[PDB]
Design a protein around this ligand. Sequence first.
Ligand SMILES: N[C@@H](Cc1c[nH]c2ccccc12)C(=O)O
Ligand SMILES: N[C@@H](Cc1c[nH]c2ccccc12)C(=O)O
Ligand SMILES: N[C@@H](Cc1c[nH]c2ccccc12)C(=O)O
Ligand SMILES: N[C@@H](Cc1c[nH]c2ccccc12)C(=O)O
Ligand SMILES: N[C@@H](Cc1c[nH]c2ccccc12)C(=O)O
Ligand SMILES: N[C@@H](Cc1c[nH]c2ccccc12)C(=O)O
Ligand SMILES: N[C@@H](Cc1c[nH]c2ccccc12)C(=O)O
Ligand SMILES: N[C@@H](Cc1c[nH]c2ccccc12)C(=O)O
Ligand SMILES: N[C@@H](Cc1c[nH]c2ccccc12)C(=O)O
Ligand SMILES: N[C@@H](Cc1c[nH]c2ccccc12)C(=O)O
Ligand SMILES: N[C@@H](Cc1c[nH]c2ccccc12)C(=O)O
Lengths: 68, 68, 68, 67, 68, 69, 69, 68, 68, 69, 69
Amino acid sequence: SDFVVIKALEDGVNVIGLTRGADTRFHHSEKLDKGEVLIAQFTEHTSAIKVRGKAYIQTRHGVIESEG
Amino acid sequence: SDFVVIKALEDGVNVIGLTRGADTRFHHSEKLDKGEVLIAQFTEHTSAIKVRGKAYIQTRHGVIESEG
Amino acid sequence: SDFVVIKALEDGVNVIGLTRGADTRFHHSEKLDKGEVLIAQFTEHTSAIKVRGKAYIQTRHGVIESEG
Amino acid sequence: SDFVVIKALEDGVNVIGLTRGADTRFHHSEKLDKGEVLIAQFTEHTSAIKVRGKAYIQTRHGVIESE
Amino acid sequence: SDFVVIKALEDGVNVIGLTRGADTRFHHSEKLDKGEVLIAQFTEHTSAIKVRGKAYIQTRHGVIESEG
Amino acid sequence: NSDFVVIKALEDGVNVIGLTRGADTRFHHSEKLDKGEVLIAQFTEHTSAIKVRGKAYIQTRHGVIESEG
Amino acid sequence: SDFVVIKALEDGVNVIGLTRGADTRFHHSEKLDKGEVLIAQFTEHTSAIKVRGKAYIQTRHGVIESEGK
Amino acid sequence: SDFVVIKALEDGVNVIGLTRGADTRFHHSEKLDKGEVLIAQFTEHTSAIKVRGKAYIQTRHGVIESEG
Amino acid sequence: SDFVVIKALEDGVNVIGLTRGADTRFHHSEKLDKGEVLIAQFTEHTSAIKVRGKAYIQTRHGVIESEG
Amino acid sequence: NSDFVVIKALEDGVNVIGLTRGADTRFHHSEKLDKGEVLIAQFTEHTSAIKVRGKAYIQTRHGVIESEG
Amino acid sequence: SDFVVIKALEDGVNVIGLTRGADTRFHHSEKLDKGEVLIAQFTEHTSAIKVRGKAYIQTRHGVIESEGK
Ligand SMILES: N[C@@H](Cc1c[nH]c2ccccc12)C(=O)O
Ligand SMILES: N[C@@H](Cc1c[nH]c2ccccc12)C(=O)O
Ligand SMILES: N[C@@H](Cc1c[nH]c2ccccc12)C(=O)O
Ligand SMILES: N[C@@H](Cc1c[nH]c2ccccc12)C(=O)O
Ligand SMILES: N[C@@H](Cc1c[nH]c2ccccc12)C(=O)O
Ligand SMILES: N[C@@H](Cc1c[nH]c2ccccc12)C(=O)O
Ligand SMILES: N[C@@H](Cc1c[nH]c2ccccc12)C(=O)O
Ligand SMILES: N[C@@H](Cc1c[nH]c2ccccc12)C(=O)O
Ligand SMILES: N[C@@H](Cc1c[nH]c2ccccc12)C(=O)O
Ligand SMILES: N[C@@H](Cc1c[nH]c2ccccc12)C(=O)O
Ligand SMILES: N[C@@H](Cc1c[nH]c2ccccc12)C(=O)O
């Protein structure tokens, strides 16, 4: 099952899980401060992930960067 | 399952999930502001995804860009 | 399961799902306006897809372009 | 399951599906006009696909052209 | 299942399916006229395929040509 | 889903011979190809080895090999 | 199942496993000192991993480096 | 399931199938004359194959030659 | 199932297996003298492996080196 | 569908020794090869390790290696 | 299932199997003299392998060398 790597490039970046299922709402928001790395799978509970704030992101499709 | 990465290049980009099944309709519209990134799977509820607004998109098939 | 990416290059492009099974008919036609992207799986209900109108298409086999 | 991409290069192209099973006959013919693209899987009901008319075809084994 | 692409380079090409099982005989011949393409799988009923007449053939192991 | 071999006869009377799967090994079928005909043949529940006699151009997943009559 | 490699680049690095399921919280924090390597899988109990402190990290998607506060 | 290609480079090349199971002995020898090719699988009955005589051999690990 | 190779670059390298499950603690420590190699899998009982001491390490993601 | 090794004897009297799978480990068979013969041998229900003694050229999925007598 | 190749570069190399499961102990030590090759799988009974003595080692991650005593 795949995962995504998120490195925060400033304080207060939010990595947000969206619920798997008929319903789509947030469920959890993990706060990363500058320099922290989160490596997060898709799961039974999470089928979409949003990143808000400035971060360096790696997936199986390559690098992408979110901007705050 | 496969997933798509979508980076909003302007405010109010919509990532819309179409229902899996005999019937096809929108079940969910996720609004991304400029710079946000959504990493979204195909799932039991979502078998097609439509992007409206300017965005940079990655899929297993490479890059493509939606335009406003 | 495989998917196809379709970017509408003009207004009114139609992405048409054909039914899986002994019977073959159109069960849905999704209209895309210019610059909209649809990423669409093969599914239990859809075993062939037809694109009509000017579009840029990616699949596992590479890029192809439909014309209006 | 694998699929074929067909792009019609002229009007009137036929993409014809052949029945899986002990017997072989055509169960559907989809007409493509010039510039339309069909992407079609092999399925429970279709184990062979015939293309008639001028089209650009892609499969996992690369490009081929019908005339 | 694997499949073979046969493009007929003259009229009257025959693509012949041989029965799966302890018995081997031809169960079907699909006749192709010049420039027709047939994309044919191996199946519960067809474990060998013979081509007669001039054709350009593609398989997973590359291109081969048959000559009449 | 099994592997397959492509055989192109380079002369008349080429034989593609199927050997039986199981405890018993014997020839169960011999397919005659004449010059320029092609046979694409799988390994199967009944065929676990394939013998080619006569001049033929053969492709497997391991590459090209040629049999000589 | 996938795993991540983490090499601590200073003392006191924490590799934090987050619980799998509807609930998200830290269930374990593994402390690494300078020079030590942890190779950790995703598991039934850990579906996200956070790294705090300076570390050199490899995953299937390539190298990334965490930086400490 | 894997297979070995054997091309006899002289008469009387012997391709020898060894029994799968707790016991090991030969259960079949298939002789090849010069220029004949044998493509043989590993099977429920054959878990090791010995080639005697001069032969050109392909396996998934490359080419090897037996010397007779 | 994945494995790591550990080559000890000095005496007393410590390869530490952490228990798989809701709880985390070490369940085994295998010490290596200089020049010894351990090739160890992820298993039902081990889901994380820590290396202490100077070692040359190979995994599917490339070479890494622990320092004592 | 297991892996297999290719052993080509470079001298007479090479031994390809199968070791028993399971809790116990012992030689269950030594196949003797003479110079120039090739054995292609799988891992199986009964054989989980293979020892080669004598001079031989060996291929496995990780490359070529040579045993010496 | 994966395997490792070990070629002894001196007499008396040991290839040691560690038990799979909750208990970890050596259950077998295979002695190789110089020039002999052992190709050994991971198994229901062995989930880690230690090599002691000078040996040339191939795995799916490439070449490694153990250095003797
Ligand atoms: N308990 C959460 C942990 C998690 C994994 N991926 C995430 C991405 C975003 C937020 C939380 C998560 C889950 O299993 O789904
Ligand atoms: N709850 C939705 C979440 C989702 C995943 N991918 C999406 C794409 C678009 C809109 C919503 C989604 C689902 O499980 O299907
Ligand atoms: N409800 C449809 C949605 C769909 C997927 N791919 C499509 C292609 C064309 C039209 C509709 C679709 C289905 O699950 O099949
Ligand atoms: N109902 C048909 C649709 C179809 C798929 N691929 C085709 C190729 C040709 C004709 C029809 C089709 C099926 O599932 O088999
Ligand atoms: N009804 C036949 C159709 C077929 C598939 N592949 C073929 C190759 C040759 C001739 C016929 C076929 C079958 O399912 O087997
Ligand atoms: N009836 C035979 C047909 C066959 C497949 N591959 C072959 C190779 C050689 C001879 C016959 C065959 C079978 O299913 O096994
Ligand atoms: N007992 C934990 C061990 C572990 C694996 N990967 C981790 C990452 C971080 C923290 C602990 C772990 C588990 O099986 O999940
Ligand atoms: N009946 C034998 C045929 C065979 C396959 N591969 C071989 C190699 C050598 C000798 C015989 C064979 C089997 O199924 O096992
Ligand atoms: N009867 C043995 C044959 C065998 C396979 N590979 C071997 C390696 C060495 C010795 C014998 C063998 C087995 O099935 O296991
Ligand atoms: N009987 C042992 C044989 C073995 C395989 N690989 C090993 C590695 C080291 C020592 C013994 C072995 C087992 O099946 O596990
Ligand atoms: N009995 C342990 C052996 C082991 C495998 N990999 C390890 C890594 C570290 C320590 C012990 C091990 C197990 O099967 O899990």
